[PDB]
Design an enzyme around this catalytic site. Structure first.
Site, PDB file in Angstrom:
ATOM      1  N   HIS A 139      -9.515  -6.215  12.011  1.00 53.28           N
ATOM      2  CA  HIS A 139      -9.822  -6.368  10.674  1.00 53.28           C
ATOM      3  C   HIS A 139     -11.392  -7.420  10.510  1.00 53.28           C
ATOM      4  O   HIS A 139     -11.396  -8.281  11.276  1.00 53.28           O
ATOM      5  CB  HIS A 139      -8.689  -7.048   9.887  1.00 53.28           C
ATOM      6  CG  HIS A 139      -9.169  -7.573   9.182  1.00 53.28           C
ATOM      7  ND1 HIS A 139     -10.283  -6.280   7.756  1.00 53.28           N
ATOM      8  CD2 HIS A 139      -8.770  -8.258   7.716  1.00 53.28           C
ATOM      9  CE1 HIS A 139     -10.355  -6.893   6.078  1.00 53.28           C
ATOM     10  NE2 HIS A 139      -8.672  -7.639   6.287  1.00 53.28           N
ATOM     11  N   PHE A 175      -8.250 -10.021  -0.176  1.00 52.07           N
ATOM     12  CA  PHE A 175      -7.417 -10.995  -0.753  1.00 52.07           C
ATOM     13  C   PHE A 175      -8.260 -11.580  -1.997  1.00 52.07           C
ATOM     14  O   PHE A 175     -10.216 -10.997  -2.057  1.00 52.07           O
ATOM     15  CB  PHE A 175      -7.808 -11.511  -0.061  1.00 52.07           C
ATOM     16  CG  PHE A 175      -7.165 -11.963   2.004  1.00 52.07           C
ATOM     17  CD1 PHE A 175      -7.770 -11.579   2.993  1.00 52.07           C
ATOM     18  CD2 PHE A 175      -5.925 -11.436   1.490  1.00 52.07           C
ATOM     19  CE1 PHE A 175      -7.360 -11.397   4.120  1.00 52.07           C
ATOM     20  CE2 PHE A 175      -5.153 -11.656   2.642  1.00 52.07           C
ATOM     21  CZ  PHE A 175      -6.025 -11.031   4.221  1.00 52.07           C
ATOM     22  N   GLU A 213       0.413  -1.592  -0.128  1.00 53.43           N
ATOM     23  CA  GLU A 213       0.367  -0.082  -0.107  1.00 53.43           C
ATOM     24  C   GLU A 213       1.032   1.560   0.272  1.00 53.43           C
ATOM     25  O   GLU A 213       0.669   2.504  -0.742  1.00 53.43           O
ATOM     26  CB  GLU A 213      -1.056   0.376   1.078  1.00 53.43           C
ATOM     27  CG  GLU A 213      -1.342   1.653   0.991  1.00 53.43           C
ATOM     28  CD  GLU A 213      -2.482   0.828   1.938  1.00 53.43           C
ATOM     29  OE1 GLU A 213      -3.919   1.544   2.086  1.00 53.43           O
ATOM     30  OE2 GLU A 213      -2.602   0.200   3.252  1.00 53.43           O
TER      31      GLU A 213
END
Ligand SMILES: CCCCCS(=O)(=O)Nc1ccc2[nH]c(C#N)c(C)c2c1
Ligand SMILES: CCCCCS(=O)(=O)Nc1ccc2[nH]c(C#N)c(C)c2c1
Ligand code: NA
Ligand code: NA
Lengths: 414, 414
Positions: free
Chosen positions: B343, B402, B320
């Site tokens: 998360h 993902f 990122e």
């Protein structure tokens, strides 16, 4: 407001199709079989029907099983829908000439009804037996419902978006709808889109037959799927998986591709009426048809053909008949391919979209099987008896899935 | 080409938000807690951690459990994500003043990571024990991953589309992206969008920790989620669910609604690189940020704030960091809310979008917890220590799930 007819949207065409059905693994062989009046629905030699004494003993397995093309590694690395997606993705690309496209302009939108569900119970058992370290590091990538689309995008190198819409029976059609949006909004120039679905098994049969939604005519399997017929008594499972290649018309001309049809518009509405049953008035479902015409630039008069959702449930066909009337398309020739191919949930919308493309290309509509006594409340011009050759210029494919998800795709002859 | 700045797209604003987190069931109380440096990650008193001796002993359950608001019927009729969706849908509508909108112009887009997965194994057992007639007629509507969005659309009366995108950690953000598309394309004027996700359990922990993707700092639970820190060692689970109400600016003015922020654009790309790992160069992920600016009408200089995906995996944060550099936004103030909230897969993108809206509204960014030793390869201006008050005019929320699914949402201060 912008439209494909007035140049508001770029022209999108279908350049390649692929599907595995209960009739044939070859889409052209399936098309030929449908025209000859063939049915993929037969009696189930599976042991789970005798084991549970299921009320449903009819349904159509794939003519060519997916795992007959899968080695030891693929049975280890992917779920079923991922295995079907990799198989269909490879067949589609070769069928399109294996072109070299810009990956940054290449998208993939593949819908499904559930995902890698069987891999959940497998990793479930693998931990109950030996602990957490016995779950494969590939478990996450096998179970995620985006897995089928992710496998296809990774195999083909699609980098302009990989999306997976979920909407039960309309998942396959909605995937084509979003792929069309991804192109006309400028995010991509070429897209692989379609739907995949798991095979017929005991728990899907039990879940759907407990809603009194499936047919019980086990004595004559080929005669059970009777959409718009007065003696219908639900739908029949028919395994399928389908993908199509769409791209801008200028992208197709630059690579020397012969377009099969035009993708003109897509409408997505919802009933907000019941968790599984469609609205009887068919207003929102018909609005989806109207919405596809507005984005296409057409009017109900231009619609010569309607590939109906037609599951053969008593409530479903009646609701769609009102939806076609609400959209003003009740003069079009109607085809219900589930009469011969059955219902494949997340993949059937994509399969019927390919059949819509083939209908416009060859100017012929296969006969709706088992349509022998028209339902009095359902007065529509459905094709039956033998294929009807006609000058079909525009067609709309309907898909009204459980949960009230209505998707209509407007197709035009190239 | 059309853009929100040059009037090509209609102006879309956020008018109401709702979320349940590991900090609080009240989004304003969660916002206050984040500013005070609070963390929702604690030690797991669940019996399944001692039962399996899991390597992961950290994570944050919801501060207020969903089923504490659920009676006997809701525990009978819906799955978990459907129960969370009905709870969040009702709180959002009341928080927006319970307006009366046109149902034909009202859409719902709710993403999720898996769906009603626990209802699969329940109907699995109910047939193994007593046969097919022991599976409830509501089983189909509970297990379908579109069920959460279908429950919300049916509860609120949304008839302009009910959609469920699946893309792992980006499902929640992608749902907001498609809801923004549904509006600017003219299919709707108001949309409820967000994401829901299941709770923390043993099999999700085992599956993700077998990829060496989760943190193992069990001695100090609040110190484990360390995005962009040099001693990070994976992500931490943090239960969440979030929804927001977006609508055209003219729709908000007609009902007397105070907008919280502006939704300016959305970019969706894909890596096509690996089934679970992000591309190291971050080119496609950064392209998603650029794409959101093009549709918004901005340039990298206007981006003052970036709500980073920031899972705290070694490879994820580094990828990122390159993505932010590729997009030219490496001068913006970065916030990684997973440092405190963890998360939540299919819901985290929606939750971090709400946090992005609150940041622009209050002109303050909470501190990234546990950021104490900057990673040498990661040179970015992340907020830490205490909240940084600033004149933030535009912000982009990142979500790289993902499968290589990259979604970037461009937000602007109202
Ligand atoms: C022909 C239509 C049948 C409906 C299938 S379905 O709607 O129930 N969805 C689904 C998805 C993935 C699956 N994998 C496995 C295995 N093994 C099964 C049984 C399965 C089913
Ligand atoms: C905080 C993040 C945890 C990841 C959850 S998940 O990514 O694994 N998806 C999922 C969806 C629905 C579910 N229902 C049940 C039950 N009971 C579970 C465990 C569950 C999990
Ligand atoms: Na159809
Ligand atoms: Na973020």
């Amino acid at each position: 407001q912008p439209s494909t007819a007035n140049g508001g949207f770029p022209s999108v065409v279908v350049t390649a199709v692929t599907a595995t059905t209960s009739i044939s693994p070859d889409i052209e062989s399936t098309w030929k079989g449908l025209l000859a009046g063939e049915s993929g629905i037969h009696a189930l030699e599976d042991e789970f029907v005798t084991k549970w004494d299921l009320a449903v003993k009819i349904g159509g397995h794939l003519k060519d099983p997916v795992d007959s093309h899968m080695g030891r590694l693929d049975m280890r690395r992917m779920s079923y829908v991922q295995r079907m997606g990799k198989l269909l993705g490879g067949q589609l690309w070769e069928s399109a000439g294996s072109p070299e496209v810009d990956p940054d302009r290449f998208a993939v939108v593949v819908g499904t009804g559930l995902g890698g569900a069987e891999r959940i119970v497998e990793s479930y058992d693998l931990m109950n037996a030996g602990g957490p370290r016995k779950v494969s590091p590939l478990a996450v990538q096998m179970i995620m419902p985006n897995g089928a689309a992710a496998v296809i995008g990774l195999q083909l190198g699609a980098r302009a978006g990989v999306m997976t819409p979920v909407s039960a029976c309309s998942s396959g059609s909605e995937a084509i709808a979003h792929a069309w949006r991804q192109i006309v909004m400028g995010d991509a120039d070429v897209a692989v889109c379609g739907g995949v679905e798991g095979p017929i098994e005991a728990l899907p049969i039990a879940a759907f037959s407990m809603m009194r939604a499936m047919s019980t005519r086990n004595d004559e399997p080929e005669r059970a799927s009777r959409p718009f017929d007065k003696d219908r008594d639900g739908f029949v499972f028919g395994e399928a998986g389908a993908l199509m290649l769409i791209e801008t018309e200028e992208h197709a001309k630059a690579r020397g591709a012969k377009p099969l049809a035009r993708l003109l518009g897509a409408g997505i509405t919802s009933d907000a009426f019941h968790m599984v049953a469609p609205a009887a008035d068919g207003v929102r479902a018909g609005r989806a048809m109207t919405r596809s015409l507005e984005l296409a630039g057409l009017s109900p008069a231009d619609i010569d053909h309607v590939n109906a959702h037609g599951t053969a449930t008593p409530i479903g066909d009646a609701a769609e008949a009102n939806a076609i009337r609400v959209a003003g398309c009740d003069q079009a020739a109607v085809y219900a391919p589930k009469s011969a191919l059955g219902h494949s949930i997340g993949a059937v919308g994509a399969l019927e979209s390919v059949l819509t493309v083939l209908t416009l290309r060859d100017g012929v509509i296969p006969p709706t099987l088992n349509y022998e006594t028209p339902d009095p409340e359902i007065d529509l011009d459905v094709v039956a008896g033998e294929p009807r050759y006609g000058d079909y210029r525009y067609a709309v494919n309907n898909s009204f899935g459980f949960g009230g998800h209505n998707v209509a795709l407007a197709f035009g002859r190239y």
